[PDB]
Amino acid sequence: MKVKQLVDKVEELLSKNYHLVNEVARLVKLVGER
Amino acid sequence: MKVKQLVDKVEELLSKNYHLVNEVARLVKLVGER
Amino acid sequence: MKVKQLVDKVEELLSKNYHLVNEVARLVKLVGER
Amino acid sequence: MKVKQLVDKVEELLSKNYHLVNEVARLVKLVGER
Numbered sequence A, B, C, D: 001m002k003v004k005q006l007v008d009k010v011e012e013l014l015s016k017n018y019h020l021v022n023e024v025a026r027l028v029k030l031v032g033e034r
Helices: A002-033 B002-032 C002-033 D003-032
Strands: none
Touching (some): A002 C002, A002 D003
């Protein structure tokens, strides 16, 4: 199923973005608190 | 429903991005006043 | 159609996270200088 | 919209996301060598 495969890929994309946004939030916190 | 749950997730990440971009802008302005 | 709407939102998120990460790199360089 | 349009877009997003994840890893390493 082409659409099911695409949605699987979007799900993984969204998990990767959840984690990278957390990483960025940490960097931004560290700069703020120097 | 999977697609709806993924839309909820992207919306949460869009809001988190919004506030981080705003925080970075605040910090750049402050650091530039040093 | 739910999938195309999800894909557009993921595109928006990725574009905004590119901007965020660009600005974080700029901020990190700035705080090292200033 | 055709399924093929969505598949091609999601492939583009996956490649763009790959580089985003790698840029965040690069920044996390740089900050961690504080």
